[PDB]
Amino acid sequence: DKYRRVPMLLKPQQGGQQYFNHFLIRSTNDRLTQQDVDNA
Amino acid sequence: VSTGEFDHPPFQFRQRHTFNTTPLHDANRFGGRTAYLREIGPKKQGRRFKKDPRTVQFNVDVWCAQQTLRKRWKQRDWEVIEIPFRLVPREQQRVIPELYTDIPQMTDPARNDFSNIRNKVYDREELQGVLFPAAGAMLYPPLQRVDKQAMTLDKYL
Amino acid sequence: MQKLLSPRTARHARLFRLAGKLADSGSPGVPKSDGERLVWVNSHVRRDKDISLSQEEERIRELMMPLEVGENSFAANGQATHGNLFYFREYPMYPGEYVPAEHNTLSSLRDELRLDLTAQSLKEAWMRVSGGVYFQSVDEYYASVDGLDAEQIGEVLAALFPELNCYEAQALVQRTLECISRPVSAASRQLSRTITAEAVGLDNAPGHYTNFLEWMGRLTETRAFKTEHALFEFSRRKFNRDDVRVMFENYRLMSKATLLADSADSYSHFYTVLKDFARKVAGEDSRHQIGVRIDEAEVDPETGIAVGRGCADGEKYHFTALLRENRDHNGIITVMGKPLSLVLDNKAWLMEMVLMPFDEANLDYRDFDAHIVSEGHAMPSIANEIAAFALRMAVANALVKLIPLTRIPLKKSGLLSVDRRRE
Amino acid sequence: GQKSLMGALPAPYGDAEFFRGRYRGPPVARPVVSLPTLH
Amino acid sequence: FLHPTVKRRFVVKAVAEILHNSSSNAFSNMLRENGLHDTAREVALCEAMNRNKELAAREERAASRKQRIENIAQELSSFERVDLSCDLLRKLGVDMTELDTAAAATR
Amino acid sequence: SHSASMPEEWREARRLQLVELYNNLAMEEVERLAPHRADRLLKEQMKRF
Incomplete structure (x- = not known):
């Protein structure tokens, strides 16, 4: 129907906010691992 | 908390036995107690009360009250015996108020017994000196209570 | 034929020694028999092995994840109909998340501060030695010669600092010349980043290239250049209603005498209005994020209980959650005196909504006790999704009241947000 | 929107990464799965 | 109890006997969490000075030593600041009851 | 380091x-x-320290 009374934060329902910092630290770890691979 | 049905389904178009849809008067609803209030066909005093909402709501309220009563009475493993004030145990030597008169009274806050006195149930085998003085033959045997300090299978011995 | 009950590995023996130390210390919950401590140690070693097995199977499952649409892999996200509905960020959301800074920028700022302090010390040393006044003529400005030659600065750096490399010493000579000329501005390096040598046309002339770069850098950081950039961005429609209102408020603060004194200059009367807009325009160096609200904690100092609220259908569902910290790790949730598994009739899709404010917060549910009081319409069962939505909002508001930084993920998940849908 | 000159100024002292409260732009979205190709 | 000048003498003697001997950071932090910040930096300066002279322009400089610990001594024995200073001195290393006998005397 | x-x-x-x-x-x-299992990044941080 018309969901105009529903907020914009509820319509996609973007959950999973806990994993983002873990993903960023894993990305930094993989960048340093790639730097270790390129040097040797 | 209970998840049984309490209200009656409202009046609308005549339902059919489809998916997510039961007829308004079915033998599955309310244990078939809608059989008193149904019309099988697809005298005004016997036809008007089956279609009134307040009448069918009062009838299902009566049936749910009957179910609540039989489930509250099937919980009873006891009975009320009028025992005099002298022979009663120490927890009942007080002034017990009536139901819905005062705050729900704890049994003994000094002896660390925080429980309702109205829900207290006493064993029959501990009151044989009070309930049966005329027999004198010990009609019920003494209750064997387990030794909590004995080394058993529960305590790895 | 007889399995030995004794600890068989050194890890088992170390855990048994820890359990014996705990039993001798008199900690609550530690068993007193030895067979129970043996059971405890064997179960803890099996739990550690199962955690290692789960970590290894997740490591293997990361490489075989079906990232494409296939036989059993279905999108169903509305990526065909709507397209890219779930957001994703590559930056740590401050101050909820933390990624450590890269070592290259750290070492660059460290070396820049070292060179700046060394050049300032050499400039102050020459100022003490030379005896005060030093006037620079027009031909001395056109020749770009200061009081010290490059040879004198190189000899001073070789004499005073023995451990000094060649290119570092040459960069120090260049920075001392730049600091004795004017206060040093770090603007030539970024102009070398954004403007290459082949674009302007100097491929064989590096000296004129660096001269043009330092001239553009010293002309960039003036007030008139910032005012012209702010006027250019005002012409390019880069403002919202908030910036228009702040420019109006800054125009209203100027009186007529200050307006005349500012219009005596050509760029200052525009700059007094457009200071905040030029702060916004300057990019990630000077524009701040708005960010979610971070409030103060409203916790009972005696009981440690925070109070949150939740609503649904406007009138029907109202809930109030009281939240406390459990220090014995036996946390449990209760709704109107009955535990949550019996209020919602063991339904996983309703109790997962109550678990969700602890999940998005990256918090353990067993470290918290919660009781939820129903204030709306009392019914014999609240096993539906809208009541569970109100329960989730109540638990999330209680978690926000207890720990304030929990509002940073919980507002992003939409758990603190109220919809207005009635019957 | 249209192409402008914002952010193109040289930032002083090069410390544009340590300011963690900086403007992060509008929230971009990413696909959760690669859709099959059209051709 | 009974501190017109007894606590003043107790604090100046205990501060003098605790400043010139050792070299640690155990005295700076407890003055820092007590609310006074400048004397914490000054006593960190004095303990670092004592550490520097213990680990390895001789007679003229050292008189400043006899200035600055004295600058500590008359600072913690002002008539308002004897109390928290003697309470903090009671916790770390100073265990004496020659001038703490007045507590038992008033009891 | 620049103060003598x-x-x-x-x-x-x-x-x-x-x-x-x-x-x-x-x-x-x-x-x-620690809980992110970031041993390479933590190794670089400890090397910088």
Whole structure:
């Protein structure tokens, strides 16, 4: 129907906010691992 | 908390036995107690009360009250015996108020017994000196209570 | 034929020694028999092995994840109909998340501060030695010669600092010349980043290239250049209603005498209005994020209980959650005196909504006790999704009241947000 | 929107990464799965 | 109890006997969490000075030593600041009851 | 490091303060990057410390 009374934060329902910092630290770890691979 | 049905389904178009849809008067609803209030066909005093909402709501309220009563009475493993004030145990030597008169009274806050006195149930085998003085033959045997300090299978011995 | 009950590995023996130390210390919950401590140690070693097995199977499952649409892999996200509905960020959301800074920028700022302090010390040393006044003529400005030659600065750096490399010493000579000329501005390096040598046309002339770069850098950081950039961005429609209102408020603060004194200059009367807009325009160096609200904690100092609220259908569902910290790790949730598994009739899709404010917060549910009081319409069962939505909002508001930084993920998940849908 | 000159100024002292409260732009979205190709 | 000048003498003697001997950071932090910040930096300066002279322009400089610990001594024995200073001195290393006998005397 | 006109007791006090500060930052980064299994990133951070 018309969901105009529903907020914009509820319509996609973007959950999973806990994993983002873990993903960023894993990305930094993989960048340093790639730097270790390129040097040797 | 209970998840049984309490209200009656409202009046609308005549339902059919489809998916997510039961007829308004079915033998599955309310244990078939809608059989008193149904019309099988697809005298005004016997036809008007089956279609009134307040009448069918009062009838299902009566049936749910009957179910609540039989489930509250099937919980009873006891009975009320009028025992005099002298022979009663120490927890009942007080002034017990009536139901819905005062705050729900704890049994003994000094002896660390925080429980309702109205829900207290006493064993029959501990009151044989009070309930049966005329027999004198010990009609019920003494209750064997387990030794909590004995080394058993529960305590790895 | 007889399995030995004794600890068989050194890890088992170390855990048994820890359990014996705990039993001798008199900690609550530690068993007193030895067979129970043996059971405890064997179960803890099996739990550690199962955690290692789960970590290894997740490591293997990361490489075989079906990232494409296939036989059993279905999108169903509305990526065909709507397209890219779930957001994703590559930056740590401050101050909820933390990624450590890269070592290259750290070492660059460290070396820049070292060179700046060394050049300032050499400039102050020459100022003490030379005896005060030093006037620079027009031909001395056109020749770009200061009081010290490059040879004198190189000899001073070789004499005073023995451990000094060649290119570092040459960069120090260049920075001392730049600091004795004017206060040093770090603007030539970024102009070398954004403007290459082949674009302007100097491929064989590096000296004129660096001269043009330092001239553009010293002309960039003036007030008139910032005012012209702010006027250019005002012409390019880069403002919202908030910036228009702040420019109006800054125009209203100027009186007529200050307006005349500012219009005596050509760029200052525009700059007094457009200071905040030029702060916004300057990019990630000077524009701040708005960010979610971070409030103060409203916790009972005696009981440690925070109070949150939740609503649904406007009138029907109202809930109030009281939240406390459990220090014995036996946390449990209760709704109107009955535990949550019996209020919602063991339904996983309703109790997962109550678990969700602890999940998005990256918090353990067993470290918290919660009781939820129903204030709306009392019914014999609240096993539906809208009541569970109100329960989730109540638990999330209680978690926000207890720990304030929990509002940073919980507002992003939409758990603190109220919809207005009635019957 | 249209192409402008914002952010193109040289930032002083090069410390544009340590300011963690900086403007992060509008929230971009990413696909959760690669859709099959059209051709 | 009974501190017109007894606590003043107790604090100046205990501060003098605790400043010139050792070299640690155990005295700076407890003055820092007590609310006074400048004397914490000054006593960190004095303990670092004592550490520097213990680990390895001789007679003229050292008189400043006899200035600055004295600058500590008359600072913690002002008539308002004897109390928290003697309470903090009671916790770390100073265990004496020659001038703490007045507590038992008033009891 | 760029201050030698200050007296040596001030320099040693600030040096001890920086030693304590670097050790506290090292322990804080050890406790922060522990549950992410970030041994390479933590190794670079400990090498920088």
